[PDB]
Amino acid sequence: GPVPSRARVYTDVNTHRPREYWDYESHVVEWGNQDDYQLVRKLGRGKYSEVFEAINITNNEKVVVKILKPVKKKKIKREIKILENLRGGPNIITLADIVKDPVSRTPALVFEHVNNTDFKQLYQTLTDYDIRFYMYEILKALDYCHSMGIMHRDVKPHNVMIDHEHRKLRLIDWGLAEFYHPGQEYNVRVASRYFKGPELLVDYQMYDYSLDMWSLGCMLASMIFRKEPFFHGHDNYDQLVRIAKVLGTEDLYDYIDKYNIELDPRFNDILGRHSRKRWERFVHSENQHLVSPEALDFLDKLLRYDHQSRLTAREAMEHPYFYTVVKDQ
Ligand SMILES: Cc1ccc(-c2csc3ncnc(SCCC(=O)O)c23)cc1
Ligand SMILES: [Cl-]
Ligand SMILES: [Cl-]
Ligand SMILES: [Cl-]
Ligand SMILES: [Cl-]
Ligand SMILES: [Cl-]
């Protein structure tokens, strides 16, 4: 059988909390009034949700409304309980209300809108300093929710919104977030393909907060090397193939033998052998200003097969890659 795993930091955060903090199935959702919110315009869209700009007619303040997909009711309580516990945390959106019955009883999330802040989706047209700066801001949100015993499990550029005029960042879309409990096996169908950690691609269910650190590394790799996505797989098997062609198959097999992970007989044959390609081979004349000795060292300590050897969110904030960035703050 597979060898169990535990988180290095924030292990027993939920154990020390009261049961009501993390037992979202027992939570009773205090639904608000839909009439208090009138939709102004449509901001974005997607299969999982439709986002709207709206105004709260009671206080005449602008808000953001997210009409949720018809998801299982248990996941609705999970996301609402997580957003309520993360309220007030740095660089995390603030849930203002929860309403229903727009078109035949549909849950909708009402988030606060910050005055005079135009939030746009995270892109790849940033300088070397802005990459450092906004990575540190994401690290703030990852460290806060991890310390609150919560995995985000869907860290990707589409879930990070930026305001380049005011240096404001928000980590959004907590529909896949979940509470961490030591010894609990978790669903491996989380995050997008390009940002799934090796623990998901080998179907290792006892993962922890370090899943978000791998996803964060994939972003850093694509930003500094100007290659989105960095690991460009076409299916879940090919994703681990692309990772193996960079990080080598050597540390991957030692990772599989450590936790006693059982792969498919055909999967172990198609991986083969690959040498650890250097981080400097992806450096070209276009992105030679975004790459530094600190960036490569920091990226290396994030992109590790062993989730227990990757950097924690705080360790990353202590890395010399952000040295001048923290002195600016
Ligand atoms: C502060 C804040 C509030 C809501 C969101 C948000 C969550 S999902 C989502 N989907 C599309 N846009 C946004 S922000 C759009 C611009 C604004 O009015 O702030 C969001 C992101 C940040
Ligand atoms: Cl994305
Ligand atoms: Cl959201
Ligand atoms: Cl799960
Ligand atoms: Cl690739
Ligand atoms: Cl962490």
UniProtKB/Swiss-Prot annotation:
The active site is at residue 154. One of its GO terms (cellular component) is protein kinase CK2 complex. ATP binds at residues 43-51, 66. Residues 37-322 form the Protein kinase domain. Residues 34-39 are annotated as: Interaction with beta subunit. Catalytic subunit of a constitutively active serine/threonine-protein kinase complex that phosphorylates a large number of substrates containing acidic residues C-terminal to the phosphorylated serine or threonine. Regulates numerous cellular processes, such as cell cycle progression, apoptosis and transcription, as well as viral infection. May act as a regulatory node which integrates and coordinates numerous signals leading to an appropriate cellular response. Can use both ATP and GTP as phosphoryl donors. Phosphorylation by casein kinase 2 has been estimated to represent up to one quarter of the eukaryotic phosphoproteome. Casein kinase 2 has been found to be increased at protein level and up-regulated at the level of enzyme activity in the majority of cancers. However, elevated levels of casein kinase 2 are present in certain normal organs such as brain and testes. Heterotetramer composed of two catalytic subunits (alpha chain and/or alpha' chain) and two regulatory subunits (beta chains). The tetramer can exist as a combination of 2 alpha/2 beta, 2 alpha'/2 beta or 1 alpha/1 alpha'/2 beta subunits. Also part of a CK2-SPT16-SSRP1 complex composed of SSRP1, SUPT16H, CSNK2A1, CSNK2A2 and CSNK2B, which forms following UV irradiation. Interacts with RNPS1. Interacts with SNAI1. Interacts with PML (isoform PML-12). Interacts with CCAR2. Interacts with HIRIP3. This is Casein kinase II subunit alpha. The lineage of its organism: Eukaryota, Metazoa, Chordata, Craniata, Vertebrata.
